């Protein structure tokens, strides 16, 4: 979940894929900009698989 | 994770919550590990070689001890009879003292007053806790039976106050993997900082945590019918236990 979108495209409280955030931050670090800060989430197996 | 002090008998009484005891042999490998509550008395010091089958620490499980670190005189600050405490005289033992009540027992007269005990010297001035600067006083929580009246000298290791007190199987694994919240979860320290209280109006109590060198404001609400294992004078660590569960 994003906490401060920085210079990225994400929102204030949107839930996203962690690997997508990693890729976006890796890209933004190569253009001299600021990525988005985030917090991890824990989901149950039924909730994570849906 | 130990913070203790020697008492009169030379034994060690521990004032830290997360004190852990271990057995390490001459080869350097841990073999036994144990947890020690707040206020246990140690038979042997740290690093003292011991033999087998010997008790090394004892404590009281039925009562939490509020233990003073310093030695001196006790004076009752904010001590008004009939609004903060009660005077009870037993009929068999004949050895009784003041009993501190709580907000749900005292009237509105004591709801604006916080009974507490302050530690001074024979000179009547504050005995500051060594290494710190704030004066040594402790706010008495409810349902605590005061034992030592005013004018009774104390010392480190004295019971300055006494506070009386899973499924298993396949469903346990299923609940672990589904990440189900427990019925009565433990309350954790949201952030590290010195703790304090607020206004207990209606059916909740308010906690406040303020970092010493950070962003001061942070508060939480607690159902006031829940036991707390922390004091209003102690600074906590982030992630530390505030309530058991």
């Amino acid at each position: 979940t994003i906490v401060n979108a920085g210079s990225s495209d994400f929102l204030e409280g949107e839930q996203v894929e962690y690997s997508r955030v990693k890729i976006a931050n890796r890209e933004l670090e190569a253009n001299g900009k600021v990525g988005a800060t985030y917090s991890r989430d824990l989901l149950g197996i039924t909730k994570a698989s849906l | 994770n130990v913070k203790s002090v020697v008492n009169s008998s030379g034994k060690l009484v521990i004032t830290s919550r997360n004190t852990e005891l271990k057995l390490i042999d001459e080869f350097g490998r841990t073999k036994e590990s144990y947890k020690v509550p707040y206020g246990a008395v140690l038979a042997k010091g740290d690093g003292e070689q011991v033999a087998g089958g010997e008790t090394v620490a004892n404590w009281d499980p039925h009562t939490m001890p509020v233990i003073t670190e310093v030695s001196g005189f006790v004076r009752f600050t904010d001590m008004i009879d009939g609004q903060t405490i009660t005077r009870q005289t037993d009929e068999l033992t004949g050895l009784s003292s003041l009993v501190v009540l709580d907000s749900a027992e005292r009237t509105a007269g004591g709801k604006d007053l916080r009974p507490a005990l302050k530690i001074v010297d024979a000179q009547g001035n504050d005995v500051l806790i060594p290494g710190t600067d704030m004066p040594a006083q402790y706010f008495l929580p409810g349902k605590a039976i005061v034992q030592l009246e005013d004018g009774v000298q104390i010392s480190s290791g004295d019971t300055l106050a006494r506070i009386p007190q899973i499924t298993g199987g396949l469903p346990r694994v299923a609940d672990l993997f589904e990440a189900r919240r427990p019925k009565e979860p433990a309350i954790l320290a949201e952030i590290s900082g010195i703790v304090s209280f607020g206004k207990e109006t209606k059916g909740k109590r308010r906690l406040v945590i303020t970092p010493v060198d950070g962003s001061d404001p942070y508060e939480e609400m607690i159902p006031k019918w829940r036991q707390l294992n922390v004091f209003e004078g102690e600074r906590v660590e982030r992630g530390d236990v505030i309530s058991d569960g």
Side-chain angles (χ1 to χ4, degrees):
Chain A
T1 315
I2 315 292
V3 291
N4 185 269
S7 179
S8 301
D9 189 280
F10 313 98
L11 289 168
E12 291 181 339
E14 189 210 348
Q15 200 179 49
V16 283
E17 282 269 322
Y18 174 57
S19 64
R20 299 302 178 176
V21 176
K22 284 166 56 182
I23 299 170
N25 289 18
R26 288 207 203 100
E27 188 277 341
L28 279 185
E29 196 108 45
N31 287 335
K33 310 180 73 175
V34 281
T37 46
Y38 50 87
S39 59
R40 296 286 282 276
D41 292 357
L42 184 73
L43 278 65
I45 56 179
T46 302
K47 191 125 300 179
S49 58
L50 277 174
Chain B
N1 269 332
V2 53
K3 194 189 308 172
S4 51
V5 136
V6 185
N7 60 15
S8 66
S9 298
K11 302 308 169 183
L12 196 57
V13 290
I14 309 182
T15 61
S16 59
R17 176 66 51 180
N18 307 324
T19 292
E20 68 93 353
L21 273 276
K22 281 176 189 304
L23 267 172
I24 285 85
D25 310 340
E26 61 276 324
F27 299 97
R29 298 178 307 188
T30 310
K31 286 289 174 295
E32 287 78 28
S33 299
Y34 308 89
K35 309 299 296 301
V36 159
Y38 174 81
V41 181
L42 293 173
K44 314 298 178 184
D46 178 78
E48 301 189 11
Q49 181 89 194
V50 302
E54 47 169 299
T55 305
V56 300
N58 302 269
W59 61 78
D60 184 9
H62 309 273
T63 305
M64 178 180 183
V66 194
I67 316 177
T68 26
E69 188 181 8
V70 284
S71 307
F73 286 7
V74 166
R75 277 203 280 96
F76 301 168
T77 55
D78 195 0
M79 189 50 61
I80 268 63
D81 185 18
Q83 293 189 12
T84 60
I85 58 157
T86 189
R87 170 63 243 191
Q88 304 182 2
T89 308
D90 304 8
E91 311 173 30
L92 301 182
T93 46
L95 310 174
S96 56
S97 294
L98 322 171
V99 182
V100 185
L101 315 180
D102 204 5
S103 174
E105 181 168 2
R106 62 171 60 113
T107 81
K111 193 174 294 181
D112 286 3
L113 320 173
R114 290 286 180 270
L117 309 191
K118 189 158 62 189
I119 311 303
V120 293
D121 55 357
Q123 320 300 327
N125 283 324
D126 322 330
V127 174
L128 305 181
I129 314 173
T132 69
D133 306 327
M134 295 67 61
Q137 77 283 354
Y138 311 89
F139 301 80
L140 298 192
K143 290 173 289 184
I145 304 180
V146 177
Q147 199 79 305
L148 285 69
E149 290 185 352
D150 195 352
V152 185
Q153 184 169 344
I154 65 164
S155 289
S156 305
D158 182 17
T159 56
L160 190 271
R162 293 187 184 180
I163 305 174
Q165 305 182 195
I166 205 174
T167 317
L170 190 58
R172 173 63 173 165
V173 170
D175 294 351
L176 281 161
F177 274 138
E178 291 288 346
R180 302 201 194 276
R181 296 181 182 268
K183 183 68 61 58
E184 179 67 285
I187 288 86
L188 269 56
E190 258 278 351
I191 198 52
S192 182
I194 182 60
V195 78
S196 61
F197 296 82
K199 301 185 304 176
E200 306 83 347
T201 312
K202 285 291 188 171
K204 272 189 180 63
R205 175 146 70 259
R206 151 163 53 255
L207 303 189
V208 180
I209 302 177
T210 288
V212 199
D213 37 328
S215 184
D216 312 355
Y218 204 16
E219 87 160 42
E220 289 82 28
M221 298 305 302
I222 286 198
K224 56 200 309 298
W225 295 263
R226 267 55 188 170
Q227 143 76 8
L228 285 79
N229 58 270
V230 75
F231 291 123
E232 56 285 348
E234 302 293 340
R235 177 204 52 83
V236 294
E237 179 83 314
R238 189 189 179 197
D240 184 67
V241 175
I242 304 303
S243 178
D244 156 71

